[PDB]
Amino acid sequence: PKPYVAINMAELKNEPKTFEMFASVGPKVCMVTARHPGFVGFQNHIQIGILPFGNRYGGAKMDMTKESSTVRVLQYTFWKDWKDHEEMHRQNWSYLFRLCGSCASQMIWGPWEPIYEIIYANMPINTEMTDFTAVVGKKFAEGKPLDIPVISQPYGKRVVAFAEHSVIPGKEKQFEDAIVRTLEMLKKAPGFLGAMVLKEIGVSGIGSMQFGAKGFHQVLENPGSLEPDPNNVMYSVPEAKNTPQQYIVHVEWANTDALMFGMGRVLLYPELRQVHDEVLDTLVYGPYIRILNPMMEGTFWREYLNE
Amino acid sequence: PKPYVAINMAELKNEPKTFEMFASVGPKVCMVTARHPGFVGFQNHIQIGILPFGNRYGGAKMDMTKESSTVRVLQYTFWKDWKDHEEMHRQNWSYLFRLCGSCASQMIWGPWEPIYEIIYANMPINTEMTDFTAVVGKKFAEGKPLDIPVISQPYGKRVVAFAEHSVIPGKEKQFEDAIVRTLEMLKKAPGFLGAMVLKEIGVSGIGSMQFGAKGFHQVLENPGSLEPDPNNVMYSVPEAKNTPQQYIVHVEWANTDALMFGMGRVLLYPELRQVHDEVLDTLVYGPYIRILNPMMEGTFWREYLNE
Amino acid sequence: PKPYVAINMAELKNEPKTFEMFASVGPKVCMVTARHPGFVGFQNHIQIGILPFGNRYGGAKMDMTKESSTVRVLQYTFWKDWKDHEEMHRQNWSYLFRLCGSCASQMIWGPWEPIYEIIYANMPINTEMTDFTAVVGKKFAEGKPLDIPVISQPYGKRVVAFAEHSVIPGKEKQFEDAIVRTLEMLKKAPGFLGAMVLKEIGVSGIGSMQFGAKGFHQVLENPGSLEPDPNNVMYSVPEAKNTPQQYIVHVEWANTDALMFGMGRVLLYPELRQVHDEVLDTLVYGPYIRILNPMMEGTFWREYLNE
Amino acid sequence: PKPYVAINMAELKNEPKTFEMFASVGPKVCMVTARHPGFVGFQNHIQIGILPFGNRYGGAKMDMTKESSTVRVLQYTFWKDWKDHEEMHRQNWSYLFRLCGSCASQMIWGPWEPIYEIIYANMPINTEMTDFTAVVGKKFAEGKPLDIPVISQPYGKRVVAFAEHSVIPGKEKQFEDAIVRTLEMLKKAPGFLGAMVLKEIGVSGIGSMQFGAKGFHQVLENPGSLEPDPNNVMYSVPEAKNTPQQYIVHVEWANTDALMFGMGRVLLYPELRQVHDEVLDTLVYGPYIRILNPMMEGTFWREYLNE
Ligand SMILES: [Fe+3]
Ligand SMILES: [Fe+3]
């Protein structure tokens, strides 16, 4: 079934010490989240650049890692029910806060953790290049050759287009119908590895370290080993849901060229351009497209999705 | 009277070429906006850093300009009626679009231009250190020594704390009452040069280059001298107003130390901490505090403000 | 069905500034061409070298990019009807001319844009190495394993042999019959990714910036933002068709070794050599073979071709 | 059938001279062992690093080869009957001892050669990327597409997780049941190339150069060409079997990322975590996971395994 998605967002200094603590702390956080039975997996991204759209963002490029002073992370966690995420955070607060707190020395902005429902998904299981022979064999044995997916390689060996959209109030239905039509046509592009549409349903205060006054002072005053009152979150997840409605259109690609010209198909192929024009007519903000590298992931979230 | 405020936000490459075109294009844009009789001035900022809040944002410091790969600009324009801003853009579209278009090669994100109402303002006219003798003389001659302001130096010789807040729906009145009480007490801090509270009323589609499909293609395809159809904006300013409600708390200071410890008074002075805790209890997001340098400005906006 | 092909040819300085504007202007031109419903895609090439034929062109080699002072571009655009190309140019002249005009500082020769009919095509859809599992699955599901193509990777991950021929008047039928026989046999060579034969039907005056006196002076005198009169083109496309008849034999290959020895099959394999000798007997000029890298492309032109 | 496994372990100086004599002497030893008809193959490993488990072993990383002063070897030889191994050593002692003796100048610890029975095996034949077409063709021809394996590339082109476990006396049955359930689920991870569980049955005294007093002095006093009395080994293989019972869990992976996150599946996937927790409850020591590179191997041992 379709899981819910929490996306933890933050911006940190682009330096070795940051990536070192990614390697130490990251696995720990993931292991703690896996204590909850509603946890079905994760996909953690580093932003490597921004899609320039010709020279609309002429200062950007798809890979800005060698020049950027900061690094943005987007950590997806997947949940059977979005309430599982909230429960997991509270049940494991002593660990999560202290783990996430150790990132402080590198932090510039965040954490900020919106919650999403998946309203459309065409996402395959991941496989390594070593796997495809056994997959093909099994699918033919089952008489289901149509269920043979593309090869979507895990652990940093593909790229993601993270397209931000906010929609004019009242035009949500038009956006959702048109974007699904768009993605159904987009899958013809070479190197297309899957797409899903995420619709924000709210924000996790606790995941964003957004407390009332009491928790705010505890966060600021913390020596590192004393958690804020997790009960001092002043709003529920849906209470923080944004209007204009926010969506993420998440599209995966074999490589950044396939991404650039593949996403470009909505501009370059007249038949698809006409369909995607219906998406553009609904927007308050966007499309703004971040280029992401899915480096650390628990690939079994796609097994839950596709069962 | 209180003007409305448009704030044009963008992120550009932090390099000499960016600042060179600031010097060339900036004045032109300002001269064009001054064509509209509703224009009462401007205050253009560069972000120089982020308030770290101890080590809450331990990767940040108040002046990150020497290390940052990007520069964020926040360009305030002041208007008798916010509709003046929208009309100005449309009436002078051929000039403005082609001027702002020349920034493309340096752009990474933006432009994004929310519109605000001022719900509280305690902001003096600017004066240079050369002016204060005449100001003192004039005010005593008129029998109005209470009207002698602090010395708030224009053109990059003071700093701004730009504090972002979003508020839980239903708590706006609690937020506004408490933040005004806070700022009324905050003005006692040494080096305090004024404060105002900005409340978002919407977003300018045209100022944000956010069009329907037609305008979107015209923007991407533009050689530099062909404006998109300005009539292709699909939403009004109020249709894009965010819920949760967004506020900017804008506080000006003599220098970055006075800023750090002055803003810090809301944490460090128990009486004020109690008042400001009422603000904290209302928030979905924030406070997130950007450190700004007001470099280019038309100081007469404060003359309109203070009559 | 078979589309018509326009090939825009130009020679520019081989330096970073040229490739930077390829990246800036290129996408824009492509987005503009896609405004016309008869546009079915594109394939843009950079020449990387010349096939030396042993030492017939002993000063040449297949990759001369590190030593050449110039770079030649060959930009294919594909059209349902060749008149669509002409119509597109005229309808979008203000954008196209200003876009192409910005290349001026790097230009040494061109643009020159002959138009071609395709008289033979054996060209597969492009696929990334990630795609083939799904393609195989789909074709077996449909009971059409013979329709499983070779893997022809898009976006610079294969190479093209661009073979220029001009034919003795009266020998066109012999050339065409023999070259098709040749290519039908050539497809047995390892790493063969497809072939097509293009027959010139004329030249686009507007795409070649070839006007009468009025337009000529407008081009020379242009500050960059004032298009020449597009009605000052003095000849129709067929009026410029060359006699001797010109052809392009366009053959795609996995890599430059497969290209060299694969094309060489028409000299090295006695049975194929006898067939290809019938081609050679018809020539006024050629074969002259440019080595091309297809870097930027709209791969959906092959979907139109093979539907 | 399942062969028995002898694993020769040693630690040597990490320098070119060590690898040079690996290349000279290594093949010789393998040729001598192949004199015995019970020999069914071998898989020789170099340890390239240690799995850090987040920062549990924070001084370790998966590839420590550029920094380490030593290199550990683990040389698997496979035998129809474990007694064949003992027989081979004694029958060919003059060659083996003089061959292994030439390693002396580089040795820091070892040799130590435990013997194991395989209690679980899910291990495919090796294939190069060049082979899979013919493999697929053959299996479909035989009507057995389910017997198409993953591509497990020989000769250094994959990696091994070498997981050491020792089990509480009385808990061997629980360990063995749980670890098999674990590995049966683990095979779902991307890039999983096979697994087996080795259970120690004893230690080869002769393979470990562990003699009585007489042989000890002969070893120490040897000029290089005088073997110790091979009959002076004072214990049989089973007499040296350890309690607590020792196991090796041997898992092969496409690459070190697939290894890290794949092995990590027993921590990150809740369903598998519950199963694997039953393994953890039985342990005296471990899991300690060495990262191995299978460089030199006789791949036909897997043909014997899978018949
Ligand atoms: Fe979370
Ligand atoms: Fe504006």
Ligand SMILES: [Fe+3]
């Ligand atoms: Fe053209």
Ligand SMILES: [Fe+3]
């Ligand atoms: Fe041995």
